[PDB]
């Protein structure tokens, strides 16, 4: 079927086709068709398939070596472990234990790893024993930079630190000094929230309010506690002065949050999406959001893959509903440029070139041999070449220096529904080349959020304690003056021979 | 001596054992060029102490006349050098097919058979998590000692996990009850910037919100540094007398080193179990005036026979005649003093209880009559799983009880540091067994007034006082008055407002009159 292709070397593929948040059952392995299918996961799986097919067709590098692939669905945290054993096992599906594996050839030569950080780490804790190379797309968590703990892991995506840096620089560019943070009830929410807290403290931003969302099943019938929880959240959002909101959440759990706020009618906010939902077609299909405010999100650069659209048109290998689910959203995904598809494509090409150089292959003419995965891991570090106008090579931490975009949502489907407003360069750690942005304001004036208005002339600062961003102002009394040039917080006393004009910056003579 | 050869013993059913027998050198986390693992050449006492406890438990259970009659119970121990890669190989071997070299990648396991019936799990929570995913997919019953993280309690991630120590949440709920009963409504909380302190601070914040007690801010402190000063500045500026330091011992030691180096204000410190033992921290001379230290420890009967058992069995290991009857090449070098240095460690009791619990669970699963068990198709783990979930088992005396949470029930003692000289000494000041039975009269407060230091905030105001809040999630009022004549045009609003010179009004007014 579509999920397997024989060859001289096999790539193990792990993709999250069905990913409902809600072990063996009756001592048999789970099967994920009972959960809702994800469009993006199937798209990325097809992206890997296209990449390997092109490598097979491409006569420029390999000497007719057939690069095969075998894809198993890592349904988020579930359905795990078993795929790793199925990859590691020998040709008889049994795995003999040894004191030293350096003489052992696995059934797959490399693994295109999971996307969920939890699955990535679970698989890596297995493969670290074998040093079987693992390349994971889109798994941003900065845990994976602890290389001594994860030697065999590499990534075709920038880390979470760059994402939070891009958010901070975006806020500073428009002087949004006063923001709200929402997190899901899991590691993705918590770790990113703490990272954002540290980044915020250093740079002159203040988190006005922070709260955990309930993890509703996307077709849940609401419990009383959940309903009151969501309305409490929207109440807190309404009371605070900031209209700038940061949301760290999976896509599924935000559907009913949006449905709820679309009945509270608390419109006019600036929504900053984390990359987990910045480009979600399903959420963006809700035309109501056109009337809920302005939506911005951070995501990887769009790189146009040639011919990808035309190509697109032993447990639990198969899917059926994936095709039907793709048929309709092909309308969006043809206009939408290949974004993460490039991460998958570049992972496949990186492994292809690493294999080609490991075999020391001259043009389409070299020998075929058994390859132990540790040698291929050793060679994967060392690739350096342009794939589609972007050079791909790994930092000492294992990340690839791909550019990031900030995308503004568009509802005029005659154009690309996601519009690029800025570009971020990770080597420079700078946001750059900001474009025109269509705000919700009556004259397209930049929306505003600060704790307090700037003081008038001749006033000293009066902090109200809870945040450094919040300060009232005090007029200087006679006999004192505002020496903002040297000190902002206290009106300096005038020389003994002179006086002051109340709220003024300088003294004068009196009798 | 011959001691490594004793680490395995055949039986009709066999229990796998994981213990931290060795520890890595500074560079022992080597950047391996090739897959094979390191070996931690440095011996450590605690691993051998716990392994001896397990061996004693198994030998007693074999000698027992009514438990498992006619059934011979074996053990199979392995080292875990606190690092996942070292741990994976022995766990893989545990899950290998019976009597064979290999583990099978089947799609269903209705007829599979691992070579061990149960696994005595690793000590630290990191290994607990990593090995728990693997083991619990296979539905292998894993009983762990010392793994305290509440994260492990989730049955939708760890179906087959059990432990013989209280989960962190019991400690933190006892702490919340302590704060509630002493009336400390306004507090500061600190976690060590590792998974332990991070998760504990998350749990405590959730409980504090659930009980109305107010967090000043969620601070986290570095492990071994330059940000601890900022955290201490925040605590100083926040005007708090009660600080919950839930931290690993190294981080607490660093924090207190800096605190005494900074002449920090004396404050009430509430301590986690680990830091309170304070082998490191109790040495600093200025500790006697750093404030008040309160904390909890859980109470269980001491494994009194253990020291004599160790002396007996190491004497036997000294006798070359018994040696006539290898996975720890470090062990055979060890002289008895290395073990004597820690011949009273209390978690030996937890190891003993875990072994006894598994033995009792197997006895129940066989439906065995004490006069003799029936001939049976050999038992398999998922049969033990369904029986263990509601089991009661004795440990000497002290009947313990599992429940669906995976914890054993427990009770705690509230302890206080009394000072004589530069040495603090632990004394009991109350009981907790789900509610706090405080013995208030015994407390000595750090203030010379020796009456309880206050740390509180209000949730009430006089009508005219401005609506204003503080705390990490607005958990406190801080309303304040306004001067006479001037009036707050809306008491639900901030701006006090003014009128002509020939007009007057009271204090805290919301109106003005000519
Ligand atoms: C961790 O929290 C999460 O569950 C979320 C969302 C999620 C839910 C179910 C299964 C996978 C992911 N994870 C992420 O966003 C990870 C970062 C990390 O996981 O470290 N970046 C993936 C970006 C492209 C993407 C690929 C596959 C998608 O569907 C299968 C999808 O929706 C989005």
From Swiss-Prot, chain A:
Stated role: Putative taste receptor. TAS1R2/TAS1R3 recognizes diverse natural and synthetic sweeteners.
Descriptive protein name: Taste receptor type 1 member 2
Positions bearing carbohydrate: 57, 221, 265, 285, 324, 384, 443, 483
Domain of life of the organism encoding this protein: Eukaryota
Parent-protein start and end of this portion: 25 to 555 of 839
UniProt GO MF annotations: G protein-coupled receptor activity; sweet taste receptor activity; taste receptor activity
Entry keywords, A to Z: Cell membrane, G-protein coupled receptor, Glycoprotein, Membrane, Receptor, Sensory transduction, Signal, Taste, Transducer, Transmembrane, Transmembrane helix
Statement: the UniProt record of this protein carries the keyword Kinase: no
Extracellular side: 1-511
Gene coding for it: TAS1R2
Subcellular location: Cell membrane
Record's keyword annotation contains Cell membrane: yes
Family to which this protein belongs: Belongs to the G-protein coupled receptor 3 family. TAS1R subfamily.
Subunit structure comment from the entry: Forms heterodimers with TAS1R3.
Cellular component GO terms held in the UniProt record: membrane; plasma membrane; receptor complex; sweet taste receptor complex
Topology class, membrane: Multi-pass membrane protein
A biological-process GO annotation: sensory perception of sweet taste
UniProtKB/Swiss-Prot annotation, chain B:
Portion of the full sequence shown: 23 to 556 of 852
Membrane topology per record: Multi-pass membrane protein
Keyword Glycoprotein on entry: yes
Spans within the Extracellular topological domain: 1-514
Name of the gene: TAS1R3
GO cellular component: Golgi apparatus; membrane; plasma membrane; sweet taste receptor complex
First-listed, main subcellular location of the protein, grouped into a coarse class: membrane
Stated family: Belongs to the G-protein coupled receptor 3 family. TAS1R subfamily.
Cellular localization per UniProt: Cell membrane
GO BP term (any one): G protein-coupled receptor signaling pathway
Organism from which the protein derives: Homo sapiens
Residues covered by region (Required for brazzein responsiveness): 494-503
Protein name: Taste receptor type 1 member 3
Record annotation: effect of changing residue 495 to P: Receptor unresponsive to all sweeteners tested
Superkingdom to which the source organism belongs: Eukaryota
Function: Putative taste receptor. TAS1R1/TAS1R3 responds to the umami taste stimulus (the taste of monosodium glutamate). TAS1R2/TAS1R3 recognizes diverse natural and synthetic sweeteners. TAS1R3 is essential for the recognition and response to the disaccharide trehalose. Sequence differences within and between species can significantly influence the selectivity and specificity of taste responses.
Glycosylation site list: 63, 108, 236, 257, 338, 369, 390, 433
Subunit structure: Forms homodimers or heterodimers with TAS1R1 and TAS1R2.
Outcome reported for the amino acid change (mutating residue 498 to L): Reduces the response to monellin
Effect of residue 495 to G: Retains partial activity toward brazzein; however response to other sweeteners tested is suppressed
Lineage: Eukaryota, Metazoa, Chordata, Craniata, Vertebrata
């Amino acid at each position: 079927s579509d999920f397997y292709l024989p060859g001289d070397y096999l790539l193990g593929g792990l993709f999250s086709l069905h990913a409902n948040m809600k072990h063996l059952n009756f001592l048999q392995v789970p099967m994920c068709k009972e959960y809702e299918v994800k469009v993006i996961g199937y798209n990325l799986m097809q992206a890997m398939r296209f990449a390997v097919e092109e490598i097979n067709n491409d006569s420029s590098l390999l000497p007719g070596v057939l690069l095969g692939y075998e894809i198993v669905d890592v349904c988020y945290i579930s359905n795990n472990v078993q795929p790793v054993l199925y990859f590691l096992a020998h040709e008889d599906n049994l795995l003999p234990i040894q004191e030293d594996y350096s003489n052992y050839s696995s059934r797959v030569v490399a693994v295109i790893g999971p996307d969920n950080s939890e699955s990535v780490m679970t698989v890596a804790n297995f493969l670290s024993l074998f040093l079987l190379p693992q390349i994971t797309y889109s798994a941003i968590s900065d845990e994976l930079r602890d290389k001594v703990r994860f030697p065999a892991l590499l990534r075709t995506t920038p880390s979470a630190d760059h994402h939070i840096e891009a958010m901070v620089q975006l806020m500073l560019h428009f002087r949004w000094n006063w923001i709200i943070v929402l997190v899901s009830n899991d590691t993705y929410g918590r770790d990113n929230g703490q990272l954002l807290g540290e980044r915020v403290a250093r740079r002159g931003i203040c988190i006005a309010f922070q709260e955990t969302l309930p993890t509703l099943q996307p077709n849940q019938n609401m419990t009383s506690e959940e309903r009151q929880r969501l309305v409490t959240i929207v109440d807190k959002l309404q009371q605070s002065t900031a209209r700038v909101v940061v949301v760290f959440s999976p896509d599924l759990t935000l559907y009913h949050f949006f449905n709820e706020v679309l009945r509270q009618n608390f419109t006019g906010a600036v929504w900053i999406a984390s990359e987990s939902w910045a480009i979600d077609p399903v959420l963006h299909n809700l035309t109501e959001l056109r009337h809920l405010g302005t939506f911005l999100g951070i995501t990887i650069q769009s790189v146009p893959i040639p011919g990808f659209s035309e190509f697109r048109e032993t447990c639990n290998q198969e899917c059926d509903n994936c095709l039907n689910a793709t048929l309709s959203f092909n309308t969006i995904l043809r206009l939408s440029g290949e974004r993460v598809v490039y991460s998958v494509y570049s992972a496949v090409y990186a492994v292809a070139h690493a294999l080609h150089s490991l075999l020391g292959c001259d043009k389409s003419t070299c020998t075929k041999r058994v390859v132990y995965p540790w040698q291929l891991l050793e060679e994967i570090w060392k690739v350096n070449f342009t794939l589609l106008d972007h050079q791909i090579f790994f930092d000492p931490q294992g990340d690839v220096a791909l550019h990031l975009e900030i995308v503004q949502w568009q509802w005029d489907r005659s154009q690309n529904p996601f519009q690029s407003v800025a570009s971020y360069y990770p080597l420079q750690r700078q946001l750059k080349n900001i474009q025109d942005i269509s705000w919700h304001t009556i004259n397209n004036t930049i929306p505003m959020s600060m704790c307090s208005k700037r003081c008038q002339s001749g006033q000293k600062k009066k902090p109200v304690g809870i945040h450094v961003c919040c300060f009232e102002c005090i007029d200087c009394l006679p006999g004192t003056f505002l020496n903002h040039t040297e000190d902002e917080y206290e009106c300096q006393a005038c020389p003994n021979n002179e006086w002051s004009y109340q709220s003024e910056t300088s003294c004068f003579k009196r009798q | 001596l011959c001691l490594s050869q004793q680490l395995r013993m055949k039986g009709d059913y066999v229990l796998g054992g994981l213990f931290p027998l060795g520890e890595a050198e500074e560079a022992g986390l080597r950047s391996r060029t090739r897959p094979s693992s390191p070996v931690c050449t440095r011996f450590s006492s605690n691993g051998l102490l716990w392994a001896l406890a397990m061996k004693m438990a198994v030998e007693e259970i074999n000698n027992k006349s009514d438990l498992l009659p006619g059934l011979r119970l074996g053990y199979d121990l392995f080292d875990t050098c606190s690092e996942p890669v070292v741990a994976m190989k022995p766990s893989l071997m545990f899950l290998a097919k019976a009597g064979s070299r290999d583990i099978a990648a089947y799609c269903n396991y209705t007829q599979y058979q691992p070579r061990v019936l149960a696994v005595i799990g690793p000590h630290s929570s990191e290994l607990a998590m990593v090995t728990g995913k693997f083991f619990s997919f296979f539905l292998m019953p894993q009983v762990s000692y010392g793994a305290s993280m509440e994260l492990l309690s989730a049955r939708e991630t760890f179906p087959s996990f059990f432990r013989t120590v209280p989960s962190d949440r019991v400690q933190l709920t006892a702490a919340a009850e302590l704060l509630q009963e002493f009336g400390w409504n306004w507090v500061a909380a600190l976690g060590s910037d590792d998974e332990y302190g991070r998760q504990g601070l998350s749990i405590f914040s959730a409980l504090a919100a659930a009980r109305g007690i107010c967090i000043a801010h969620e601070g986290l402190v570095p492990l071994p540094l330059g940000k601890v000063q900022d955290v201490l500045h925040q605590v100083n500026q926040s005007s708090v007398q009660v600080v919950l330091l839930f931290a690993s011992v190294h981080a607490a030691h660093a924090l207190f080193n800096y605190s005494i180096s900074s002449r920090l204000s004396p404050k009430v410190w509430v301590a986690s179990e680990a830091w309170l033992t304070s082998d490191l921290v109790m040495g600093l001379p200025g500790m006697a005036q750093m404030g008040t230290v309160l904390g909890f420890l859980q109470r269980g009967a001491q494994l009194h026979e253990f020291p004599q058992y160790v002396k007996t069995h190491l004497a036997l290991a000294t006798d070359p005649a018994f040696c006539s009857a290898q996975r720890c090449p470090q062990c055979d070098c060890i002289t008895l003093q290395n073990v004597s240095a820690g011949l009273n460690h209390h978690q030996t009791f937890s190891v003993y209880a875990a072994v006894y619990s598994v033995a009792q669970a197997l006895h129940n699963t066989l439906q065995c009559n004490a006069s003799g068990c029936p001939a049976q198709d050999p038992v398999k783990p998922w049969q033990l799983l369904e029986n263990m979930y509601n089991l009661t088992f004795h440990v000497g005396g002290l009947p313990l009880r599992f429940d669906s949470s995976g914890n054993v029930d427990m009770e705690y003692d509230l302890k206080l540091w009394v000072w004589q000289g530069s040495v603090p000494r632990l004394h009991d000041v109350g009981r907790f067994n789900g509610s706090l039975r405080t013995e208030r009269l015994k407390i000595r407060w750090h203030t010379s007034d020796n009456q309880k230091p206050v740390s509180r905030c209000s949730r009430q105001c006089q009508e005219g006082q401005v609506r204003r809040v503080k705390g990490f999630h607005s958990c406190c009022y801080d309303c304040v008055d306004c001067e006479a004549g001037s009036y707050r045009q809306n008491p639900d609003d901030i701006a006090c407002t003014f009128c002509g010179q020939d007009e007057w009004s009271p204090e805290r007014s919301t109106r003005c009159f000519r």
